Amino acid sequence: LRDSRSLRGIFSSFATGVTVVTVGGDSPHAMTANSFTSVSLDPPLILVCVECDAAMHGSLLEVGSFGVSVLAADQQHVALLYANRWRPRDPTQFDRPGWARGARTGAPLARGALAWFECALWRAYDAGDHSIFVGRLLTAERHDRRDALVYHSGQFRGLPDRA
Amino acid sequence: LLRDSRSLRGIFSSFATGVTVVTVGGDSPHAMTANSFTSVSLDPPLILVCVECDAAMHGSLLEVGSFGVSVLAADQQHVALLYANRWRPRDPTQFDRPGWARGARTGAPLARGALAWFECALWRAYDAGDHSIFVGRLLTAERHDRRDALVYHSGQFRGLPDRAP
Numbered sequence: 001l002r003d004s005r006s007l008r009g010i011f012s013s014f015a016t017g018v019t020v021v022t023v024g025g026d027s028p029h030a031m032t033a034n035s036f037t038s039v040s041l042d043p044p045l046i047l048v049c050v051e052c053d054a055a056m057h058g059s060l061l062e063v064g065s066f067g068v069s070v071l072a073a074d075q076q077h078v079a080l081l082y083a084n085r086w087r088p089r090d091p092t093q094f095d096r097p098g099w100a101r102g103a104r105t106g107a108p109l110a111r112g113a114l115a116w117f118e119c120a121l122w123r124a125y126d127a128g129d130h131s132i133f134v135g136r137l138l139t140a141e142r143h144d145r146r147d148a149l150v151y152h153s154g155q156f157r158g159l160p161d162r163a
Numbered sequence: 164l165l166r167d168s169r170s171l172r173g174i175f176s177s178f179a180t181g182v183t184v185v186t187v188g189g190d191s192p193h194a195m196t197a198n199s200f201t202s203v204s205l206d207p208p209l210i211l212v213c214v215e216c217d218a219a220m221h222g223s224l225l226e227v228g229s230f231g232v233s234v235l236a237a238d239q240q241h242v243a244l245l246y247a248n249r250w251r252p253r254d255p256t257q258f259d260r261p262g263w264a265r266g267a268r269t270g271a272p273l274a275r276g277a278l279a280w281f282e283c284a285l286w287r288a289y290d291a292g293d294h295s296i297f298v299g300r301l302l303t304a305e306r307h308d309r310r311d312a313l314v315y316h317s318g319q320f321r322g323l324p325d326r327a328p
């Protein structure tokens with residue numbers, strides 16, 4: 001239980017979709033998250049868990065709102081990039097055609113995603129080495145159903161789906 | 164459209180998940196199906212689940228203060244359905260049947276054939292609208308044989324192929 005590689009392994013038995021959480025503002029940023037969870041319908045709430053030592057932890061608190069893009073299976077590379085701590089953190093990357101801007105927050109939203117969310121930060125709860133960020137939905141939108149990106153047993157997987 | 168439940172649930176459904184059964188032991192053992200299960204922290208080892216305020220498990224979790232979590236394999240769809248059924252028989256005797264083990268630390272039922280088992284002590288229960296977020300500190304955790312996983316996506320149950328090398 002004290003071993004990270006082992007415990008991460010047990011955790012990996014639970015399959016997930018994959019998202020990219022984003023902020024806009026002066027210093028736009030993006031990161032890959034699979035801790036995304038639908039929480040409540042009234043009021044409409046979701047949550048994500050972000051490492052305390054991660055840059056997005058501070059950005060979320062600074063900006064107070066965020067975007068979420070649920071990734072299709074052909075967006076594995078997007079998932080990989082924004083999980084990469086060594087990545088370019090340059091705001092120019094979000095001006096590329098692969099990004100849309102949320103109508104409500106201006107947060108980057110990944111084109112081709114299965115779905116988009118914009119949220120206002122409702123609360124941030126302590127949770128050990130992570131914090132639980134609860135967002136109240138401002139906008140939400142589902143796109144064409146197609147194969148979904150899935151993360152299971154530490155592997156990226158494609159989940160077939162069609163309307 | 165955010166005011167419409169079916170519309171919004173449809174959008175939420177675009178995010179695929181595995182499926183668990185959350186359980187308590189004690190005098191009135193109980194179980195419920197949950198896909199809001201999420202790994203939260205490694206130090207200390209924490210997980211969370213989101214449980215409806217009006218759901219019976221909401222009270223059981225608070226009353227008993229510890230719980231089990233079983234991650235379901237693809238051939239356990241019927242388990243997911245059963246313990247998602249509000250009309251289900253609620254006799255505690257069912258958790259004495261052979262498809263269940265009892266967690267050594269919590270006595271919570273754990274489903275045999277599951278991909279993984281967790282036992283947890285309730286750390287905190289946080290308000291979250293019509294749900295509460297229950298954060299559990301792990302007392303035990305154990306991974307079993309890798310095999311096809313139960314996945315819930317687009318409001319459908321799916322099998323996700325998986326096998327040890």
Ligand SMILES: Cc1cc2nc3c(=O)[nH]c(=O)nc-3n(C[C@H](O)[C@H](O)[C@H](O)COP(=O)(O)OP(=O)(O)OC[C@H]3O[C@@H](n4cnc5c(N)ncnc54)[C@H](O)[C@@H]3O)c2cc1C
Nearest residue numbers: 031032033034035049050051053054055056083084085151
């Ligand atoms: C499928 C997948 C799902 C994921 N889900 C989540 C999730 O739900 N929640 C979550 O928090 N993460 C998650 N991650 C990991 C996350 O995507 C990466 O950690 C990402 O790079 C974090 O972005 P960041 O800018 O917010 O934090 P970063 O600044 O990139 O920090 C990431 C970690 O690396 C350390 N670090 C980074 N750069 C340095 C540096 N120069 N020097 C010293 N230390 C450094 C940090 O201390 C931190 O612990 C996931 C990754 C994958 C592949």
Ligand SMILES: Cc1cc2nc3c(=O)[nH]c(=O)nc-3n(C[C@H](O)[C@H](O)[C@H](O)COP(=O)(O)OP(=O)(O)OC[C@H]3O[C@@H](n4cnc5c(N)ncnc54)[C@H](O)[C@@H]3O)c2cc1C
Nearest residue numbers: 195196197198199213214215217218219220247248249315
């Ligand atoms: C893949 C899947 C994933 C799921 N994930 C979650 C999750 O993460 N969190 C969660 O909370 N649920 C989740 N559910 C639903 C949950 O499993 C069911 O609601 C289950 O019945 C709850 O069990 P319970 O005894 O704890 O609550 P219950 O007592 O069964 O109540 C469940 C709901 O039904 C109502 N209800 C039941 N009986 C009555 C009654 N006599 N009179 C009036 N109202 C009644 C309650 O108002 C309540 O809203 C999921 C279901 C599925 C199929």
